[PDB]
Amino acid sequence: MNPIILIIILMTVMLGTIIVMISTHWLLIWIGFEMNMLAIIPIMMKKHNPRATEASTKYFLTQSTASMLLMMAIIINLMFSGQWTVMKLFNPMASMLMTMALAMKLGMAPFHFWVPEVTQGIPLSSGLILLTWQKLAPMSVLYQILPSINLDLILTLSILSITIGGWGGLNQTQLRKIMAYSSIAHMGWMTAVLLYNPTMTLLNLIIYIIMTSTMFTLFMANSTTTTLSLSHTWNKAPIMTILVLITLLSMGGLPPLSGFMPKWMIIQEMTKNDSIILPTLMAITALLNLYFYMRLTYSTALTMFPSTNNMKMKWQFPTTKRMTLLPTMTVLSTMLLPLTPILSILE
Amino acid sequence: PGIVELPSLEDLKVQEVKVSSSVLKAAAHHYGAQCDKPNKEFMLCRWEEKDPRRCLEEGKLVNQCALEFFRQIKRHCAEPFTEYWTCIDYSGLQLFRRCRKEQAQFDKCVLDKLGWVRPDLGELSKVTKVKTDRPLPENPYHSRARPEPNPEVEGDLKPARHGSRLFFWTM
Amino acid sequence: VAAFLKNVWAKEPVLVASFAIAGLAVILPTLSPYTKYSLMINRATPYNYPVPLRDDGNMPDVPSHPQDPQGPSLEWLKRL
Amino acid sequence: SMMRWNRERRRLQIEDFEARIALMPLLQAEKDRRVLQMLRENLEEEAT
Amino acid sequence: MNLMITLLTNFTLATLLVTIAFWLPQLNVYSEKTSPDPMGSARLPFSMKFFLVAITFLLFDLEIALLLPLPWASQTTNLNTMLTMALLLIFLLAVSLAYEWTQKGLEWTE
Amino acid sequence: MFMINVLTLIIPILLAVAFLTLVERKVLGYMQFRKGPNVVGPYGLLQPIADAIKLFIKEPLRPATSSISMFILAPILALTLALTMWIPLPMPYPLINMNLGVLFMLAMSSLAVYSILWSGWASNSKYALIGALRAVAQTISYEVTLAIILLSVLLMNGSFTLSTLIITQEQVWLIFPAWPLAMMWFISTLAETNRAPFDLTEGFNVEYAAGPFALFFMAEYANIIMMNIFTTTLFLGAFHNPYMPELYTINFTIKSLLLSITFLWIRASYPRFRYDQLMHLLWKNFLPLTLALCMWHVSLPILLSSIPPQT
Amino acid sequence: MSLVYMNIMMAFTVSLTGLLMYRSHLMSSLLCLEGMMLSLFILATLMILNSHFTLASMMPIILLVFAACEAALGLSLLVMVSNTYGTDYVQNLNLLQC
Amino acid sequence: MMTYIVFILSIIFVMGFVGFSSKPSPIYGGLGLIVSGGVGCGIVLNFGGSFLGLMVFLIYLGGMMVVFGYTTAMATEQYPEVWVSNKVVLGTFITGLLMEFLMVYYVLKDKEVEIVFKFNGMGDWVIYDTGDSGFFSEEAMGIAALYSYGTWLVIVTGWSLLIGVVVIMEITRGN
Ligand SMILES: CCCCCCCCCCCCCCCCCC(=O)OC[C@H](COP(=O)([O-])OC[C@H](O)COP(=O)([O-])OC[C@H](COC(=O)CCCCCCCCCCCCCCCCC)OC(=O)CCCCCCCCCCCCCCCCC)OC(=O)CCCCCCCCCCCCCCCCC
Ligand SMILES: CCCCCCCCCCCCCCCCCC(=O)OC[C@H](COP(=O)([O-])OCC[N+](C)(C)C)OC(=O)CCCCCCCCCCCCCCCCC
Ligand SMILES: CCCCCCCCCCCCCCCCCC(=O)OC[C@H](COP(=O)(O)OCCN)OC(=O)CCCCCCCCCCCCCCCCC
Ligand SMILES: CCCCCCCCCCCCCCCCCC(=O)OC[C@H](COP(=O)(O)OCCN)OC(=O)CCCCCCCCCCCCCCCCC
Numbered sequence A: 001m002n003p004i005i006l007i008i009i010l011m012t013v014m015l016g017t018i019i020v021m022i023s024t025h026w027l028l029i030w031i032g033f034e035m036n037m038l039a040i041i042p043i044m045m046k047k048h049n050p051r052a053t054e055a056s057t058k059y060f061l062t063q064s065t066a067s068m069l070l071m072m073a074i075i076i077n078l079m080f081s082g083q084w085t086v087m088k089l090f091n092p093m094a095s096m097l098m099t100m101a102l103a104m105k106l107g108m109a110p111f112h113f114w115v116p117e118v119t120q121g122i123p124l125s126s127g128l129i130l131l132t133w134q135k136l137a138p139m140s141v142l143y144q145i146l147p148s149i150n151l152d153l154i155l156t157l158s159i160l161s162i163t164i165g166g167w168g169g170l171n172q173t174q175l176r177k178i179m180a181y182s183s184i185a186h187m188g189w190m191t192a193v194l195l196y197n198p199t200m201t202l203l204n205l206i207i208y209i210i211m212t213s214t215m216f217t218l219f220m221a222n223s224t225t226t227t228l229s230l231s232h233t234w235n236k237a238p239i240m241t242i243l244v245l246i247t248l249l250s251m252g253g254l255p256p257l258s259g260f261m262p263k264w265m266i267i268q269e270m271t272k273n274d275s276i277i278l279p280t281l282m283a284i285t286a287l288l289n290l291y292f293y294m295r296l297t298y299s300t301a302l303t304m305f306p307s308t309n310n311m312k313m314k315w316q317f318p319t320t321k322r323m324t325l326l327p328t329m330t331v332l333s334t335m336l337l338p339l340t341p342i343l344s345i346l347e
Numbered sequence B: 001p002g003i004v005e006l007p008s009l010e011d012l013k014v015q016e017v018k019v020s021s022s023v024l025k026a027a028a029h030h031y032g033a034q035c036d037k038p039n040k041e042f043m044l045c046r047w048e049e050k051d052p053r054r055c056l057e058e059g060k061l062v063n064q065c066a067l068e069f070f071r072q073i074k075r076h077c078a079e080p081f082t083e084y085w086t087c088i089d090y091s092g093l094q095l096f097r098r099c100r101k102e103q104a105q106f107d108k109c110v111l112d113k114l115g116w117v118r119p120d121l122g123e124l125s126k127v128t129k130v131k132t133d134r135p136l137p138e139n140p141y142h143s144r145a146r147p148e149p150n151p152e153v154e155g156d157l158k159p160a161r162h163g164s165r166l167f168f169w170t171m
Numbered sequence C: 001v002a003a004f005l006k007n008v009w010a011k012e013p014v015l016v017a018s019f020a021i022a023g024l025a026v027i028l029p030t031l032s033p034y035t036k037y038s039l040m041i042n043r044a045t046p047y048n049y050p051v052p053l054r055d056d057g058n059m060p061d062v063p064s065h066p067q068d069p070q071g072p073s074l075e076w077l078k079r080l
Numbered sequence D: 001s002m003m004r005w006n007r008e009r010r011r012l013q014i015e016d017f018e019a020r021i022a023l024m025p026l027l028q029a030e031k032d033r034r035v036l037q038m039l040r041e042n043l044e045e046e047a048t
Numbered sequence E: 001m002n003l004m005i006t007l008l009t010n011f012t013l014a015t016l017l018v019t020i021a022f023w024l025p026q027l028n029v030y031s032e033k034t035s036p037d038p039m040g041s042a043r044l045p046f047s048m049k050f051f052l053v054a055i056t057f058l059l060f061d062l063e064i065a066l067l068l069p070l071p072w073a074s075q076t077t078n079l080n081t082m083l084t085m086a087l088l089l090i091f092l093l094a095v096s097l098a099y100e101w102t103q104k105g106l107e108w109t110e
Numbered sequence F: 001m002f003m004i005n006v007l008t009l010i011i012p013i014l015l016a017v018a019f020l021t022l023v024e025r026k027v028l029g030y031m032q033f034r035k036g037p038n039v040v041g042p043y044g045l046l047q048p049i050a051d052a053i054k055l056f057i058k059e060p061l062r063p064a065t066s067s068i069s070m071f072i073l074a075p076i077l078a079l080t081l082a083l084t085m086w087i088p089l090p091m092p093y094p095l096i097n098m099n100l101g102v103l104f105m106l107a108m109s110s111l112a113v114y115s116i117l118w119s120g121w122a123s124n125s126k127y128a129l130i131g132a133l134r135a136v137a138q139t140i141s142y143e144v145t146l147a148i149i150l151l152s153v154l155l156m157n158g159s160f161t162l163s164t165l166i167i168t169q170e171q172v173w174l175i176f177p178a179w180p181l182a183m184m185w186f187i188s189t190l191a192e193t194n195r196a197p198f199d200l201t202e203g204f205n206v207e208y209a210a211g212p213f214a215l216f217f218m219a220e221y222a223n224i225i226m227m228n229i230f231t232t233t234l235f236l237g238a239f240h241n242p243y244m245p246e247l248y249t250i251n252f253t254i255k256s257l258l259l260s261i262t263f264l265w266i267r268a269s270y271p272r273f274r275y276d277q278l279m280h281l282l283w284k285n286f287l288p289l290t291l292a293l294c295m296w297h298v299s300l301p302i303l304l305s306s307i308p309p310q311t
Numbered sequence G: 001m002s003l004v005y006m007n008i009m010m011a012f013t014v015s016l017t018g019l020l021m022y023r024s025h026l027m028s029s030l031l032c033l034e035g036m037m038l039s040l041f042i043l044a045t046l047m048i049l050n051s052h053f054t055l056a057s058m059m060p061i062i063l064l065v066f067a068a069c070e071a072a073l074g075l076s077l078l079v080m081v082s083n084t085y086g087t088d089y090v091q092n093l094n095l096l097q098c
Numbered sequence H: 001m002m003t004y005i006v007f008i009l010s011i012i013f014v015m016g017f018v019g020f021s022s023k024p025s026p027i028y029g030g031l032g033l034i035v036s037g038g039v040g041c042g043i044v045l046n047f048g049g050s051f052l053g054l055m056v057f058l059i060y061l062g063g064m065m066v067v068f069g070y071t072t073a074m075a076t077e078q079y080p081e082v083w084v085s086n087k088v089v090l091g092t093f094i095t096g097l098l099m100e101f102l103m104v105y106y107v108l109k110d111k112e113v114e115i116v117f118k119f120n121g122m123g124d125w126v127i128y129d130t131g132d133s134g135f136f137s138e139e140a141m142g143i144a145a146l147y148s149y150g151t152w153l154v155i156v157t158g159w160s161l162l163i164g165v166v167v168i169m170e171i172t173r174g175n
């Protein structure tokens, strides 16, 4: 791809998300999602193999169906309110359809069935864009319509997201599918606290984006797409062996790392509202995520080490990859729990 | 809720201007010049009362002054006006520009026998002022009492008492 | 700037005519003395009823009749 | 030619619109009495 | 109503002429013909370029759909804004055509 | 009484299409230093009748259609869209007087490509389908410049109303302020109707019988006469006395006959384009000029203070 | 609720369930998706015309433009799939099972 | 019956969506969606939104379903059907369309008027011509205010169309 065309298309992705964030009119919300989808499709087809075309097709179909359901929600709101302000909705039918459409856009379960496939088919940088930047616009719309969101619906989608994103990561050796099921679990955590305190939603979204970008930046820096290929990193770049894995200890949510901060603040703000069963069971399923991701940590900085001979040739070459913000993102994703009351800046 | 209050059918009886649309359009500019004051009183009453039930007598004055206008045409300039609205009436879009000689003869007979100058281009679309003797409607929308707003913040901003108070963080 | 222009008017006169007409269409209405009259004609075209004002007692510019001297004029439009 | 004739057509449009404006109070009074007549007829038939 | 009556008349005349032009030569008992192309029997080859000209049509047709209310847009009171947005829409249609040019998109059906 | 008006529209359309075949064969005859038909009728007046009776009793080609439904609906849609393009035409008064008659004709002419596409798919041949796809791509390419030229001229009309376009041209023919739009419009109408030098289909619906081929042929000629009448009304607007409308009718009929004969005289004068040459002619020649003149006719009535009225 | 809007929503849901039940082709999926867009156009148009709400008259045109650009994107994706495999079958799009 | 023409066209619209949504083939699905677009355009035109219905015919059916049929003809390889003499090749077509229009009549049965006559739509349905608008269409002026009022909407729409051109030329090159 021509780098000018790449810059213009990435600015169009960013512009679509900014248009969703700043606009007060529902048609401009729908326009921002259309522009965001249209612009992100060539980022996925950047390498032109059949897997990226299949992934772009499945992503197009799911996001297109979600855009149509979003416009049907907007149209029902115009029926029952005669106006277009992006605020609460004035029909439970419009609220239900817009919550379903945004859950399809996030890949929350049971609309999760595209995220591991699409994340598998596309490269690591476009997978990073899809799992970090594309979450921002539907979480903004869910932030603005929360006087209308049905409680039982959003809690059902959140627990089904956390359970399916947990039980998806057992059978996986592909790193992109692991990050996709981690995405499904974390979006369930974010929408669990949405109707109680959406500042903790924004805290979980920011910490998740930092940890996800650290993991995808390390996967790009090591040229590893599978567990089996990630396990050759100790003989090639030994500082990458610890950074990937203590960032991955952050991502499951485990103290004293900063990925324990969002889940702890979510449990904290849901027990103010006299919900005790629900954060307990959601964090038990997060321990199931810890179970599988700790097995991956064992496989990379423990048992299955063995190397090949052509590592002897890779030893004579240093990295030229621009590991952009990787020490910054790695320090932010691990040592930020002593600065936990910084979360008031998101209020 | 409440009974909607409608005027009787005797409150709605007035003598009607039983002429066609080309007949109205042929005398339109002279009607706007000559019948200006009750028409403008009525349309001020109509955009202020926002209710056709509070405008019935001004509408009757409009209908009366229109009937006096057409009687005053009929007594003086019946044949040039008939010659003019017949030619206006032939057209599909009812053009003024197809009928300039009948317009000239109608304006000639009207300026001679009655002294009515046809208004220039720009005049009948002016916003005029109307002297009324009825009171201004103080609540034409019948809005009830507005909800009292939430109290604003006032006072200087003291620092947080012992900081964030988040479980053990002393600042 | 004159050798290139003759070279492109020799090679591609369709696109030279296109860029010249589009350039005139861009930078010409900013230079015309009649662009203000388009605005003045469009805002003098009475689609709505000129709703009159309640005469409070001090409005010496608002007329009482169309044929009164005060008020906006369209003699510039009849003359031009 | 189109300059002269479209200016003339705008003046003829303004003449037609002033004819409409002069006719509007009569038509508005008749429309008011029309809809009040129809609502009163429907009210009496609702009563019977 | 007059429109729909005229449409029904045109459709009925068209279907009547099609019915006559199919049934009138079938009254002939001519013969039962036995064993009734450049390629032999192979698959239809897909051509990427025909699809590209169809999509370029669709995108410029959507830009034309944006261009259509301009004779009504000329009547506005905000004429500087209207003229700027009209010239901007036709300029973005021209930028689409220039980008379609300079990436060899209009080639072998230019 | 309205049905009398509809039939006296649509049956003289079929008669004028019938004798356009005679006029085309005679004019192509005399321009090629020969004669057209003069034996069958007195100077060929019975040639369209003999041709129509021959085409409607000829043996059907007996196709194995890929679809029954599209094989039947492609001539029906071709004839219906050929006949509905005539009802808003102000000659001087339209049969159906509508506010958006220009836009109506543009929409019904955009619908006309489905007869080509369905006729090409409803045959078993792949070469017929390839020819139909090339014809559809040609037609959709030239509809772009149709729409943009038409919008640019309607910026002098004031509305989409066809009857207003006579009022627009009461002082000057509209070809005088818009002759480049007129000539690109004329070649674009020449390329809409698959007409030489743009008839590459004769260099898609050859699965049909002689009867249905006559139906596609007469839909094509109704489109040709219609587009010439529309171009006459659009650029060469006749004088309309509202008391004697037959003056306008004689005047636009003479002008539309001259423009149809100009189609006949262009097909007898030029070699055909190669397919990419007319794709080039659209996309790289007519379309930049069309966008530039569209900018020019947007911005010109604002700089001349000559914006036409909406009504 | 209102009468014709129930029909337009029912058409939307029928085309939804057509998109939500794949039979054979990706083109049929794009057809059901654009039928959903058509029903959205009709429903938005009937509301905005019924309400006499003037500035939303430009809304369904923008709906049509953005979603037909979306459909052009879908047709290009289908073409790249059909050039990969030969057909546009949805069962040829299953390499992301593993 | 003639009062209820918008409801009848909506019933035809729902039946056409049932027609192509059951998906016999993408080509017959495209044909059913063309017919459904025409009758839904008739629904729009029978409120008085004439520019929006002509936008349906000119843009939806005129460009987009053309490109859908054009793309569909370049896939899904054709095969013949029954072609026996004119009773079978056209008489079965006439009887099939007669059964389809008799189905359009047959879905309007006594179980339907229980929804119709209880919630009578006509009598007060199309309230578009309630009073006077003036010398304009409100629909046309609201569409025309895309240029004076809708500046941001024009910017984002034209930018998305330019980006659409760029995006199609990137993903179709295959390199
Ligand atoms: C006259 C003008 C000039 C005056 C100048 C006066 C000062 C002169 C010296 C200038 C420099 C001043 C430095 C800061 C002042 C002292 C702060 C302090 O000790 O706070 C006590 C703080 C609370 O104790 P306190 O008795 O209640 O308060 C005494 C004061 O009133 C404390 O005041 P406070 O109560 O207002 O403090 C507010 C609040 C007080 O704290 C709280 O409210 C409690 C919550 C604190 C966070 C707990 C998070 C637990 C979960 C995460 C654990 C992470 C893993 C641990 C570290 C692993 C290794 C990296 O602070 C925080 O929440 C901040 C977060 C903790 C950072 C503390 C400052 C670190 C600066 C240097 C960092 C170097 C790396 C050390 C390791 C990084 C972690 C500390 O102690 C702790 O939280 C325990 C950790 C130890 C604190 C850091 C000690 C700093 C010196 C380190 C030297 C050795 C470095 C070795 C190499 C690098 C490491 C391998
Ligand atoms: C509607 C009534 C009738 C109207 C007239 C039409 C009837 C006459 C028809 C004649 C026979 C045509 C038969 C078909 C021919 C098709 C081929 C053909 O003509 O191709 C078109 C040719 C194509 O060009 P070409 O192919 O010859 O050139 C080669 C092109 N390159 C280099 C790219 C390979 O020309 C055009 O496209 C021009 C169209 C008309 C443009 C009019 C411009 C007007 C002047 C503008 C201003 C100029 C000065 C610059 C600005 C100054 C500012 C101060
Ligand atoms: C409430 C919150 C509101 C919003 C606040 C801000 C949110 C920020 C969200 C960040 C989302 C990041 C999305 C991904 C980066 C975007 C730019 C991009 O495309 O980078 C990838 C790029 C591709 O280059 P390419 O040529 O494809 O290389 C492949 C090899 N040939 O280049 C590469 O591959 C180079 C390798 C390194 C890439 C590192 C990218 C890191 C980006 C994230 C930084 C951390 C997030 C910011 C801080 C927290 C914000 C919440
Ligand atoms: C500012 C106003 C708005 C301007 C933008 C809108 C214009 C309206 C028309 C839109 C045209 C869209 C397509 C333009 C593409 C330009 C690039 C191009 O075509 O380059 C190739 C061409 C050489 O042609 P070639 O590649 O060989 O094609 C085969 C046939 N020979 O190379 C060329 O032909 C060179 C083309 C560029 C140079 C033309 C210079 C004309 C200058 C006229 C005087 C100045 C007018 C004012 C405007 C500024 C122009 C710089």
Ligand SMILES: CCCCCCCCCCCCCCCCCC(=O)OC[C@H](COP(=O)(O)OCCN)OC(=O)CCCCCCCCCCCCCCCCC
Pocket: F015, F041, F042, F045, F046
């Ligand atoms: C808006 C205007 C539309 C106009 C449409 C029509 C255009 C054509 C106008 C007329 C052209 C010429 C008509 C005459 C043609 C020649 C007829 C003829 O001469 O037939 C002779 C033939 C044999 O006769 P026989 O008895 O053998 O003679 C031997 C003599 N010792 O005997 C026969 O063949 C038998 C008799 C046949 C007569 C045919 C007459 C012409 C039929 C035309 C049909 C349409 C008429 C117009 C309809 C619309 C207007 C009302």
Ligand SMILES: CCCCCCCCCCCCCCCCCC(=O)OC[C@H](COP(=O)(O)OCCN)OC(=O)CCCCCCCCCCCCCCCCC
Pocket: E001, E003, E004, E007, E011, F073, F076, F077, F080, F081, F084, F097, F098, F099, F100, F101, F104, H034, H035, H036, H037, H038, H039, H041, H042, H043, H045, H046, H050, H051, H053, H054
């Ligand atoms: C396989 C099926 C059969 C295929 C062959 C036959 C069908 C295809 C060919 C014919 C297509 C017909 C298209 C008709 C609608 C065109 C747009 C239209 O109605 O424009 C006319 C007019 C708009 O002008 P305006 O002046 O604004 O309105 C009058 C108010 N003064 O608006 C009016 O005057 C409104 C009048 C009432 C509304 C009539 C709407 C049309 C009838 C319903 C749809 C019929 C066609 C369905 C199938 C379409 C193709 C699939």
